[PDB]
Short mmCIF file of C-alpha atoms in Angstrom, two decimals:
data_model
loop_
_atom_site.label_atom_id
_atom_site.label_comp_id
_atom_site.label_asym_id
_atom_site.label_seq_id
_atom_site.Cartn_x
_atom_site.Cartn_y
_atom_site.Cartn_z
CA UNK A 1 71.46 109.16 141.55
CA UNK A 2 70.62 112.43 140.65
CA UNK A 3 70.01 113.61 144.14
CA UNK A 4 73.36 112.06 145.41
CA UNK A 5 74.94 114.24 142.67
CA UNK A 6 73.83 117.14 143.64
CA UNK A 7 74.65 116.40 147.09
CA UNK A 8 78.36 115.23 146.01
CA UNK A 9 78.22 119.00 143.92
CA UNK A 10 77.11 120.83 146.84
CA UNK A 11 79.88 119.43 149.40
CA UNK A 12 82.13 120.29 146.54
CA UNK A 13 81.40 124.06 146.12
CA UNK A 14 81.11 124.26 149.91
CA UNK A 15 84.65 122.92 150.52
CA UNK A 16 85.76 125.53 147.92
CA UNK A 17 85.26 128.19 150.06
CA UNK A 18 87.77 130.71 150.83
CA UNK A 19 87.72 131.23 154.91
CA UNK A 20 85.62 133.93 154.88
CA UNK A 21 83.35 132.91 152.77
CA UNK A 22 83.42 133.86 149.25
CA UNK A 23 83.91 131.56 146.28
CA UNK A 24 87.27 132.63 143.46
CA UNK A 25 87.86 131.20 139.94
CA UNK A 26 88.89 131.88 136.53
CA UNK A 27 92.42 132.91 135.70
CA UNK A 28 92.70 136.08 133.16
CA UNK A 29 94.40 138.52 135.80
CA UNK A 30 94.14 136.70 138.99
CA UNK A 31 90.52 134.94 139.82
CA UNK A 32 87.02 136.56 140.03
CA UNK A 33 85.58 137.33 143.23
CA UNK A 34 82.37 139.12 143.56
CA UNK A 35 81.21 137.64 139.93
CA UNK A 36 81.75 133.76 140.68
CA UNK A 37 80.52 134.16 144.44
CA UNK A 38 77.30 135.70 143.19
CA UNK A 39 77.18 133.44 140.59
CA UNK A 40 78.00 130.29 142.81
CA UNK A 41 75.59 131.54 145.86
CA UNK A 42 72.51 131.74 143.63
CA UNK A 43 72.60 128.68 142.69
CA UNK A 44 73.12 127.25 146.04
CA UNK A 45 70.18 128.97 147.71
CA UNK A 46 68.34 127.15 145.25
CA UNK A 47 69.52 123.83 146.61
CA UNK A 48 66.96 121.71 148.78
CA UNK A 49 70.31 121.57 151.05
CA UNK A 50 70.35 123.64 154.40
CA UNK A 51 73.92 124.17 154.48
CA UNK A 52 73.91 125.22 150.68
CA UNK A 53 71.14 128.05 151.33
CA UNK A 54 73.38 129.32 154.99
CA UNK A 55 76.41 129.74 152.61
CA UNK A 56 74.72 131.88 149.91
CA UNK A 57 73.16 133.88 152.28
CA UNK A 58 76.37 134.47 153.83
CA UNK A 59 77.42 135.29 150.50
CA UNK A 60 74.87 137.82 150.28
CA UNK A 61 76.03 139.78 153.33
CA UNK A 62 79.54 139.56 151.63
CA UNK A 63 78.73 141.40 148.51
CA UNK A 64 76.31 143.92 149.96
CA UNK A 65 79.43 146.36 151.19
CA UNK A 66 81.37 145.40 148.16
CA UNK A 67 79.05 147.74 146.05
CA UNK A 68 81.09 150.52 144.58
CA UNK A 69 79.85 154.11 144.98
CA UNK A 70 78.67 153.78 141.30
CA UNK A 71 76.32 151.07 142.18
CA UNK A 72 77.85 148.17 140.79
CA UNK A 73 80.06 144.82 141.44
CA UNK A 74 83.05 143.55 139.04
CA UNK A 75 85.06 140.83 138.03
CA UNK A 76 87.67 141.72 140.67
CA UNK A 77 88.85 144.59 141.62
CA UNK A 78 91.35 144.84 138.90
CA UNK A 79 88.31 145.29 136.30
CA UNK A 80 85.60 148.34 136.01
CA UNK A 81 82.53 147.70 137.25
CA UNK A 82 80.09 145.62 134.73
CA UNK A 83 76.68 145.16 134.66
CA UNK A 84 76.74 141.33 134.29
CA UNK A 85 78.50 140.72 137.38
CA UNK A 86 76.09 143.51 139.00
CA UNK A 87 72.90 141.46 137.53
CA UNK A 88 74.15 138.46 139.19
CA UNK A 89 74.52 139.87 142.65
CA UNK A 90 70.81 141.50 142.22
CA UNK A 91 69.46 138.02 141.31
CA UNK A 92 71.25 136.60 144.88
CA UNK A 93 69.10 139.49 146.18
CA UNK A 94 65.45 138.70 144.19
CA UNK A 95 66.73 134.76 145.26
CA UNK A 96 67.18 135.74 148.65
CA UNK A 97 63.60 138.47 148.76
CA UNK A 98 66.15 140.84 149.52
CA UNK A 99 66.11 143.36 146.66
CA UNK A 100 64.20 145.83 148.51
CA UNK A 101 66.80 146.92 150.23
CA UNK A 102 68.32 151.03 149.54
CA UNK A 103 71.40 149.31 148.15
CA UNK A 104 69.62 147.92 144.95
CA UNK A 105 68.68 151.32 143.60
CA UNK A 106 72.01 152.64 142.39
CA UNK A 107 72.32 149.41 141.32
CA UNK A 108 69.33 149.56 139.27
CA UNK A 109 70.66 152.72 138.16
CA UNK A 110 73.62 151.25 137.53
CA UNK A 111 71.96 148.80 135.11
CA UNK A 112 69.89 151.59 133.41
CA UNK A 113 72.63 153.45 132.20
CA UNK A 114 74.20 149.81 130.26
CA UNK A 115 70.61 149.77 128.21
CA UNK A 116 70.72 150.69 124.45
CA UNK A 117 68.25 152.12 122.19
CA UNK A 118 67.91 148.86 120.58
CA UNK A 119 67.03 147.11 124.17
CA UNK A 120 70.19 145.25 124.64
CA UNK A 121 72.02 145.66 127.41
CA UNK A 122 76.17 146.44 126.96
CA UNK A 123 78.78 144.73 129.63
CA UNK A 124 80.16 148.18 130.10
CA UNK A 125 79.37 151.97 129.95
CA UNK A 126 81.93 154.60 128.68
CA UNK A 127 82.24 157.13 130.87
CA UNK A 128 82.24 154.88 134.09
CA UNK A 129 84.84 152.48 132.38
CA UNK A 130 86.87 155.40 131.47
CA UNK A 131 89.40 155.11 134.06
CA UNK A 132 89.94 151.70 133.54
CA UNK A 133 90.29 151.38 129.79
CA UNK A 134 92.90 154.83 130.07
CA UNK A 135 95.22 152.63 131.41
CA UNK A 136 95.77 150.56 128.01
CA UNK A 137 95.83 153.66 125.31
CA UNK A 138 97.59 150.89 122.91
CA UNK A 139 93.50 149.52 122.90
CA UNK A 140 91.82 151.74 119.37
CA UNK A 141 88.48 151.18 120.54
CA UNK A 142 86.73 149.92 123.39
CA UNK A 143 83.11 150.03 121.20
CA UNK A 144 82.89 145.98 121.65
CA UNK A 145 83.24 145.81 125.14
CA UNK A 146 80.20 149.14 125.78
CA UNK A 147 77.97 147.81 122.51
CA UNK A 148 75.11 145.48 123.21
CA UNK A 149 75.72 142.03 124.59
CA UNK A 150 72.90 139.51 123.81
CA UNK A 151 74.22 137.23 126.71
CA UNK A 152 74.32 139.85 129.41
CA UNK A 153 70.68 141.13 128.22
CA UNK A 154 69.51 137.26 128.91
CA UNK A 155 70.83 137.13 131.97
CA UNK A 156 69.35 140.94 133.30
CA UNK A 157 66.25 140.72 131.62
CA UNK A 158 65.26 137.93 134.32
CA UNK A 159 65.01 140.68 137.21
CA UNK A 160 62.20 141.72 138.38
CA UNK A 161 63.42 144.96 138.94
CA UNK A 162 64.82 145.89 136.11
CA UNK A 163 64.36 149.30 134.92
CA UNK A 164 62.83 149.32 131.59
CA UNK A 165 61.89 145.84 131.31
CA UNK A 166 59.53 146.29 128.62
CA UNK A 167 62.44 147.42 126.54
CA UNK A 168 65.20 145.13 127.32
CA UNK A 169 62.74 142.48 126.74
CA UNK A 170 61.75 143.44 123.17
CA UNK A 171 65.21 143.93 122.38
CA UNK A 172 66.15 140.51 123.79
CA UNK A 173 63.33 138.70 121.61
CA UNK A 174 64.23 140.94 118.52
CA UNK A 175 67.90 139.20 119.01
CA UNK A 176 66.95 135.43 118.69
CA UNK A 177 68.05 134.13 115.69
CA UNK A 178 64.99 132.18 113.55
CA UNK A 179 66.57 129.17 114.55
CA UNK A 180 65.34 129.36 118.10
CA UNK A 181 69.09 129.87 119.72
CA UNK A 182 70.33 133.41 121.36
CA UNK A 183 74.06 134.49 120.40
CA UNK A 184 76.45 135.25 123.08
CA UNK A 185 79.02 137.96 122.67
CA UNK A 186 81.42 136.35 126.09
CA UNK A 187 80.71 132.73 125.63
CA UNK A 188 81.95 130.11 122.87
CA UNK A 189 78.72 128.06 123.80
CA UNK A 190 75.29 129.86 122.82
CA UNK A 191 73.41 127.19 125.16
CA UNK A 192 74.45 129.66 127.71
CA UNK A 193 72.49 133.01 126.05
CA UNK A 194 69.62 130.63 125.33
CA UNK A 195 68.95 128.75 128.73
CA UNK A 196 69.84 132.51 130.59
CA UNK A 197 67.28 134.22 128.06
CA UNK A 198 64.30 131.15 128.25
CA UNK A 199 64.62 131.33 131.99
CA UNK A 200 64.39 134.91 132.07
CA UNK A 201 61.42 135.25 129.61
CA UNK A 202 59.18 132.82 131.45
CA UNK A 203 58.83 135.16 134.40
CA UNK A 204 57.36 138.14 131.45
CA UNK A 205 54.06 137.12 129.46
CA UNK A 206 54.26 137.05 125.45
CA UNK A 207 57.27 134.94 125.13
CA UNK A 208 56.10 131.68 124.82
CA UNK A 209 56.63 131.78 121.00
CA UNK A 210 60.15 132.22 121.67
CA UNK A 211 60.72 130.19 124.48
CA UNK A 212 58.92 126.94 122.29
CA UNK A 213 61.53 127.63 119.74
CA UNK A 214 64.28 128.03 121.60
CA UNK A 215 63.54 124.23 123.64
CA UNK A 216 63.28 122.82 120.35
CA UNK A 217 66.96 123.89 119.35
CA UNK A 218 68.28 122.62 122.34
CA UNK A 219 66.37 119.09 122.38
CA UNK A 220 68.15 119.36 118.97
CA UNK A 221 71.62 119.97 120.30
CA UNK A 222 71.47 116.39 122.56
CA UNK A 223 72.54 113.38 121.64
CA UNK A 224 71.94 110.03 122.12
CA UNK A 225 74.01 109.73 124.51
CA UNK A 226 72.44 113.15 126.49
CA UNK A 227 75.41 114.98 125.08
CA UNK A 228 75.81 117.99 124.19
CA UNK A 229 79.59 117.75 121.97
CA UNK A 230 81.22 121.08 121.16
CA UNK A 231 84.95 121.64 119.52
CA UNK A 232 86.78 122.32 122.84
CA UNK A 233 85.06 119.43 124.61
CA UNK A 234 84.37 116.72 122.24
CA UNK A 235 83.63 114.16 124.15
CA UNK A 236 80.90 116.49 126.11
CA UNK A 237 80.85 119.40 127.43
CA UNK A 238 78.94 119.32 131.00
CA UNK A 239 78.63 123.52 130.93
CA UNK A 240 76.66 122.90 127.27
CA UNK A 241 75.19 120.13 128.08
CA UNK A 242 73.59 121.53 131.34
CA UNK A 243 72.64 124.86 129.80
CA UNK A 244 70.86 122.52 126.29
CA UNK A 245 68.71 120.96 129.56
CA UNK A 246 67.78 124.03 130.92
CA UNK A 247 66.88 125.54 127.20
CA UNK A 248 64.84 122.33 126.86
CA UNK A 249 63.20 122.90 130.25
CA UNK A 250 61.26 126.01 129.48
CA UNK A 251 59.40 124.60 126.68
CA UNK A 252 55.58 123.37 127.20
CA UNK A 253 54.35 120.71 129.45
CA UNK A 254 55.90 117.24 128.42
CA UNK A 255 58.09 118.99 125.84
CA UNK A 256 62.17 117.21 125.89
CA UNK A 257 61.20 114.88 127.93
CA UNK A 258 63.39 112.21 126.58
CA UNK A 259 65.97 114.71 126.22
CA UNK A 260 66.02 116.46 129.95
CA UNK A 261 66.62 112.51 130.97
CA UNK A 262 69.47 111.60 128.71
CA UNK A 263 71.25 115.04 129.43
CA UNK A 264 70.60 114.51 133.05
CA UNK A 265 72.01 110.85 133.03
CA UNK A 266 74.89 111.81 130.86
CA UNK A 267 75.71 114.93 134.02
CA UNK A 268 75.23 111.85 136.33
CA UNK A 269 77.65 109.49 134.63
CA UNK A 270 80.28 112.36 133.92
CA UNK A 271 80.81 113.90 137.37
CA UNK A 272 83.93 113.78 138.97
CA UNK A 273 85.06 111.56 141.95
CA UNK A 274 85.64 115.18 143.51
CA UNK A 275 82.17 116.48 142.91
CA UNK A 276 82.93 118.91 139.98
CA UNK A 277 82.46 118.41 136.55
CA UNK A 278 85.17 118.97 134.18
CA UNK A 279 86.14 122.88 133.41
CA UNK A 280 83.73 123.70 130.75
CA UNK A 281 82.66 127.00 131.30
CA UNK A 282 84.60 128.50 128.12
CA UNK A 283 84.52 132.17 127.99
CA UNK A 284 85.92 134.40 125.57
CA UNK A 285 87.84 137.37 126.13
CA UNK A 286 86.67 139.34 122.67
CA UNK A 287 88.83 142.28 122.03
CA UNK A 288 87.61 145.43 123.01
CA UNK A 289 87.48 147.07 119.41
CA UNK A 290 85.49 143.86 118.45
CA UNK A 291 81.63 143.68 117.37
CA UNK A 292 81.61 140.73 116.46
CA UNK A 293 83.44 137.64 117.75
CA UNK A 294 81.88 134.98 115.75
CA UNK A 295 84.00 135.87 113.19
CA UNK A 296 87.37 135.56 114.40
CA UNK A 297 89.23 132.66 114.33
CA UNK A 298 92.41 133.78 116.05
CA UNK A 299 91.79 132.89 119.69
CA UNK A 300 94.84 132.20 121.94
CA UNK A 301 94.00 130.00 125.18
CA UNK A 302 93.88 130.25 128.28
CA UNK A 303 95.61 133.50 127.99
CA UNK A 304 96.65 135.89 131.33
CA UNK A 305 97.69 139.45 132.41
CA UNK A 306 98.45 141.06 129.04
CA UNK A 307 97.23 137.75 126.66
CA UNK A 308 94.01 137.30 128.34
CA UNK A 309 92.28 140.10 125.62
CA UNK A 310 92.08 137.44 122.55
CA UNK A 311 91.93 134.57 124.67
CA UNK A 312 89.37 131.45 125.44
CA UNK A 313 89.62 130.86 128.89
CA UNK A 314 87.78 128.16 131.19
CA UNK A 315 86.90 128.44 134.98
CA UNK A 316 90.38 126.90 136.24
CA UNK A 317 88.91 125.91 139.52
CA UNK A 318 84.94 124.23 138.11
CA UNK A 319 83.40 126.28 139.99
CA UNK A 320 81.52 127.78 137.24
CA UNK A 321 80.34 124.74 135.36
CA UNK A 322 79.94 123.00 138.63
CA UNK A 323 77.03 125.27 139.64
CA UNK A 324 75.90 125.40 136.20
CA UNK A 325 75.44 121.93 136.18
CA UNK A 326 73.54 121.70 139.46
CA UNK A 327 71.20 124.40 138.41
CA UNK A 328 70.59 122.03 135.45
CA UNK A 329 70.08 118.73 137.63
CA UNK A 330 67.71 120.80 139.80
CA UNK A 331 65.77 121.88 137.25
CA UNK A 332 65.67 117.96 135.68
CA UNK A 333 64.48 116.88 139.20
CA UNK A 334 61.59 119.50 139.10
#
């Protein structure tokens, strides 16, 4: 059941391939490249699936030259290099036990420069965004986009690599809210701070505490049905539902049991004749000048070139929650 759909998700992300290789999706000013194939390659060489670990790997050799002088990856070329997209190709590498290589220390460096006093970690740095947000001298302030991002300081702090560790770590405990969850400055969903930050934290010792919390929320967050519901995707969304798993996961021994099942069954029962799961990978395009998108309540949708600042958009293709969930039924299996 569950092994048969993660076989069914596998020959789906496979037969998404472009020809040479790499893995495209989202929408907001033509599709993600180097992002979404790291992204989707890490979770394949994950896979107990030969022909899942040959394609990341081959993914790997893809991004390596991609690297820009600066030491980082992007969205696409038509964005500034980021250090979210850059942590996700250095986690192919640590998958891989290729981040020895020369080519991860500028991007190390890379990610050093994105860390705050505070510990968190910002999507972007000023001066090597520069160019890039020049081009739009309509925006007031790009202080959002280069402040601290709790969901990008999740995802980095799981390196092994990572410069300052100790730091980013503190500051990544210091943001989890005393109800166990993580905030997310690009996501609607905070599953996806808290399973990033729980799987991060169990590879660093004194953050137990926080992961225990933090599975408790999320065996909270599933329902009956293995659900987890959200306003876009009442009926369930599979990118919320996978990540409230994977939250659940990193508690202690026998903790969620009950709850890793029913969200497991519920991916099982909801995948698509195709493979995928339904687009659920809702990520919000917060406004450069803004600190603080909980608080707004003016999204557009789906928004592109111009309208995609402002805008909640989903992973057009499902490649995003498609992996997402497979890292989740993977995790259930184990």
């Amino acid at each position: 059941d569950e092994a048969s759909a993660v076989r069914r998700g596998v020959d789906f992300l496979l037969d998404r391939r472009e020809a040479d290789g790499r893995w495209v999706d989202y929408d907001l000013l033509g599709p993600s490249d180097d992002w979404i194939t790291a992204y989707v390659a890490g979770v394949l060489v994950q896979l107990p699936h030969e022909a899942a670990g040959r394609a990341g790997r081959a993914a790997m050799d893809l991004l390596v030259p991609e690297q820009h002088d600066n030491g980082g990856w992007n969205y696409s070329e038509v964005a500034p290099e980021d250090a979210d997209s850059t942590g996700w190709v250095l986690r192919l590498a640590e998958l891989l036990g290729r981040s020895g290589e020369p080519w991860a220390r500028p991007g190390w460096e890379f990610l050093a420069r994105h860390v705050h006093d505070d510990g968190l970690v910002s999507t972007y740095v000023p001066d090597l965004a520069k160019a890039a947000f020049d081009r739009y001298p309509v925006v007031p302030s790009w202080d959002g986009w280069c402040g601290g991002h709790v969901c990008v300081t999740a995802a980095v702090a799981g390196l092994a690599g990572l410069p300052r560790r100790e730091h980013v770590v503190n500051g990544l405990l210091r943001a989890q809210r005393p109800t166990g969850e993580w905030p997310a400055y690009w996501w609607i969903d905070p599953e996806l701070s808290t399973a990033l930050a729980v799987e991060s934290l169990a590879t660093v010792p004194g953050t137990e505490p926080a992961r225990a919390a933090a599975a408790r929320w999320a065996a909270g967050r599933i329902g009956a049905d293995g659900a987890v519901t959200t306003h876009l995707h009442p009926e369930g969304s599979p990118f919320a539902t996978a990540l409230a798993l994977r939250a659940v996961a990193q508690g202690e021994p026998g903790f969620g049991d009950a709850q890793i099942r029913a969200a497991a069954g519920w991916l099982t029962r909801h995948q698509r004749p195709d493979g995928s799961w339904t687009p659920s990978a809702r990520l919000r395009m917060v406004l450069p000048w803004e600190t603080d998108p909980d608080s707004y309540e003016d999204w557009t949708f789906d928004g592109v070139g111009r309208a995609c600042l402002g805008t909640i958009a989903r992973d057009t293709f499902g490649l995003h929650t498609t992996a997402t969930v497979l890292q989740a039924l993977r995790t259930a299996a184990t």
